[PDB]
């Protein structure tokens, strides 16, 4: 194990700890590609989690300065201020692949703003947030998952990232509420006559189910549109992205099977993930 291997193994640890679903799928990529995904995913996770280190923006400002250093001087040695293992790995990736730095900055800007979170007035604001925290991740991963990127490649990766984030929102309604966050928009909540605190206390009801399904239908349609355009990705990445996506679509059914509970985090069994891989791998 070289020092750089240690850095990437740490990024893998971070990715697998945060999401068994994505790790299950992306770890199937060829070695050089999966390591780049681990590094990009790990940087985005550190950014997403940064405010709670001390309780303010210090660490986030350091992550940003580190990324700016890599962008400006990819081939110079930097004494990183945030997490050296992750930044050394990101820099290693940047030395070999085009990295969309402004997408990392859009993500950082979204996380800074989330400090002053106020509910979204409309679905456009919710979808803007999905872009900021997840469509940006799809954008940064685009060159790793495709041989020749076009605006189309980025558009499909961005839409996949945003769809996955909407599924995350649909799975986490209860845990997010506990953490003083409601992502459904005020407009849609008013329209469907739903109060999340009231549902967290009293259980599901038809108004809530209708609202949840309204968003689930949007995620499912976007998923279909991404699958229809899967050929923008490299031949090796195609079944991996289809698997990652199918596992997430499956979380929606797990929520329905659990009667839309706001009191536990549902999940797709590892054994079920393997079943989905078999079904897709047989098509390829």
From Swiss-Prot:
Lineage: Bacteria, Bacillati, Bacillota, Bacilli, Bacillales
Pfam families, alphabetized: SQS_PSY
Protein residues bound to (2E,6E)-farnesyl diphosphate 1: 18-21, 41, 45, 171, 248
Reactions catalysed: 2 (2E,6E)-farnesyl diphosphate = 15-cis-4,4'-diapophytoene + 2 diphosphate
Task of the protein: Involved in the biosynthesis of the yellow-orange carotenoid staphyloxanthin, which plays a role in the virulence via its protective function against oxidative stress. Catalyzes the head-to-head condensation of two molecules of farnesyl diphosphate (FPP) into the colorless C(30) carotenoid 4,4'-diapophytoene (dehydrosqualene).
Enzyme class: transferase
Swiss-Prot/TrEMBL GO biological process terms: carotenoid biosynthetic process
Name listed for the protein in its UniProt record: 4,4'-diapophytoene synthase
Organism per entry: Staphylococcus aureus
Enzyme nomenclature, EC number: 2.5.1.96
Residues that coordinate or bind (2E,6E)-farnesyl diphosphate 2: 45, 165
């Amino acid at each position: 194990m070289t020092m750089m291997d240690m850095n990437f193994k740490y990024c893998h640890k971070i990715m697998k700890k945060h999401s068994k679903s994505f790790s299950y799928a992306f770890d199937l990529l060829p070695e050089d590609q999966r390591k780049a995904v681990w590094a990009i995913y790990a940087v985005c996770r550190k950014i997403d989690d940064s405010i709670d280190v001390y309780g303010d923006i210090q660490f986030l400002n350091q992550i940003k300065e580190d990324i700016q250093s890599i962008e400006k001087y990819p081939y110079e040695y930097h004494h990183f201020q945030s997490d050296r293992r992750i930044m050394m790995a990101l820099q290693h990736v940047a030395q070999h692949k085009n990295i969309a730095f402004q997408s990392f900055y859009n993500l950082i800007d979204t996380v800074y703003k989330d400090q002053h979170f106020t509910m979204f007035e409309t679905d456009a604001e919710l979808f803007g947030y999905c872009y900021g925290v997840a469509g940006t991740v799809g954008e940064v991963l685009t060159p790793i998952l495709s041989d020749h990127e076009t605006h189309q490649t980025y558009d499909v990766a961005r839409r996949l990232g945003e769809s996955l984030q909407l599924i995350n929102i649909l799975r986490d309604v209860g845990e997010d509420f506990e953490n003083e966050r409601i992502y459904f928009s005020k407009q849609r909540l008013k329209q469907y006559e739903v109060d999340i605190a009231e549902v967290y206390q009293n259980g599901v009801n038809n108004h809530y189910i209708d609202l949840w399904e309204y968003y689930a239908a949007i995620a499912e349609k976007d998923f279909r549109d991404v699958m229809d355009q899967i050929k923008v990705f490299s031949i090796e990445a195609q079944p991996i992205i289809e698997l990652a996506a199918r596992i997430y679509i499956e979380i929606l059914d797990e929520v329905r099977q659990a009667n839309y509970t706001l009191h536990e985090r549902v999940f797709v069994e590892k054994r079920k993930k393997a079943k989905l891989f078999h079904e897709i791998n047989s098509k390829y």
